[PDB]
Write an enzyme that holds these catalytic residues in place. Sequence first.
Site, mmCIF file in Angstrom:
data_model
loop_
_atom_site.group_PDB
_atom_site.id
_atom_site.type_symbol
_atom_site.label_atom_id
_atom_site.label_comp_id
_atom_site.label_asym_id
_atom_site.label_seq_id
_atom_site.Cartn_x
_atom_site.Cartn_y
_atom_site.Cartn_z
ATOM 1 N N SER A 1 2.234 -10.361 29.912
ATOM 2 C CA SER A 1 1.206 -9.893 28.993
ATOM 3 C C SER A 1 1.676 -9.834 27.531
ATOM 4 O O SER A 1 0.854 -9.728 26.622
ATOM 5 C CB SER A 1 0.705 -8.516 29.446
ATOM 6 O OG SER A 1 1.761 -7.575 29.454
ATOM 7 N N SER B 1 6.244 -9.223 32.425
ATOM 8 C CA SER B 1 5.499 -9.437 31.187
ATOM 9 C C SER B 1 6.350 -9.474 29.916
ATOM 10 O O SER B 1 5.744 -9.647 28.842
ATOM 11 C CB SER B 1 4.416 -8.371 31.047
ATOM 12 O OG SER B 1 3.284 -8.825 31.844
ATOM 13 N N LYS C 1 3.575 -5.741 20.297
ATOM 14 C CA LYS C 1 2.521 -5.972 21.277
ATOM 15 C C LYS C 1 1.361 -5.001 21.067
ATOM 16 O O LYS C 1 1.565 -3.825 20.757
ATOM 17 C CB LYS C 1 3.109 -5.824 22.681
ATOM 18 C CG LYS C 1 2.192 -6.172 23.827
ATOM 19 C CD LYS C 1 2.940 -5.979 25.148
ATOM 20 C CE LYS C 1 2.013 -6.067 26.342
ATOM 21 N NZ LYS C 1 2.747 -6.357 27.593
#
Length: 440
Positions: free
Chosen positions: A153, A177, A78
């Site tokens: 996210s 997320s 990420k």
Amino acid sequence: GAMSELSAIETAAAIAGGSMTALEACDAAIARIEQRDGPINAVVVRDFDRARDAAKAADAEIAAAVRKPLLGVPMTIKESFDIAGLPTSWGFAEHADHIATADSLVVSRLKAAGAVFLGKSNIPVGLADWQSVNPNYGRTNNPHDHSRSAGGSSGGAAAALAAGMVPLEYGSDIGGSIRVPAHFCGVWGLKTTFDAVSLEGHYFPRTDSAKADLSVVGPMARTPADLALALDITSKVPLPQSRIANLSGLRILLLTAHPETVADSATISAVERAAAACEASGATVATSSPDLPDLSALVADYTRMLLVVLARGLAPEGTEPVSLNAWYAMLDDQARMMRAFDRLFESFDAIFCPVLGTTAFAHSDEPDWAKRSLSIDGGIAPFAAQLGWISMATYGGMPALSMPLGADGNGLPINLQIITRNWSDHDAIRIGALVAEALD
């Protein structure tokens, strides 16, 4: 599936045995990204030149008889995690050129196990959405339906896994997320026990500040085995391994309703089917418990803490901020809620429940969740209320697995949420592995 990819463990074994080289594994993943990421837009930071050099160094270790659990395995992470030499922007245009000078802890752990980082995956602005879209990189599209959100996210991470680009990823979770993108894209994601994994290097751009409450980081993959290995590699200390050999005797609390939100028929049916498969394998399933905490009070308290944490205790102009003394009282409330779940898990090994009440929604340009809605069985429902489904594990601190169950009538994946007691992260993974066996 008919079209498959090597898992992280299978890749390391293929490299260790000599059926492929680390550079071939790296070049194969680079090819999948360039071939598949066009309409998906998941791997938005690319580091392919330095990755091939690291892959060559991995092959040098292999020839020197060195063996490590992820040696030569290519992955992405990420975008909010620091990698030395790559930007960390959190999707802010102002921070697009913020280049990290040190790897984050999780990255350093995975590299020490031999992993090769090809790049970083897309996120929403400030990591504050169940979508992955920002002015620096654009929008990530769900590989199962390009018109739907990939989640957020960690949405770019989940989309890259669903499209088979890389076998391993790593995300963060403060409002679902990790669990939500895994659910939207139909891959595996472990929200870890609060404080089990270091957030060092998961820094807001140009600071050394990581969240001190609610937020966790955890692995994402396509197999529970890859999750367990990545957890053991990145844990602060080695966490207790699972002693669960099968489902016989397991005690499951099955929840398909929430006092403050809703799930649609396909989701309810899917979570029920998973519980029935465990019951057929010797498990016991309950549908209520007097020890279940007040979920309505939980979501209200979790939301007040979440808003304070996100704002760093700053209040909008005019209103009075929460005092430090009041904050200490909020943590006491949370600790009290954590102990309530401790008592619940004296009677149950796991909670089974939805990840969210519905599958991946259509792309939204509305930044205010209070101005968003969702379709539940053709009915309009509030968007933000869906926070209730992920609030238990985040506020209570428990680990929670998001694992594939199937898809709804439109081919959109539906995942199961498996919640186990604090520090039993390997149990949550193991129960998920047993559930997947029981479904086949």
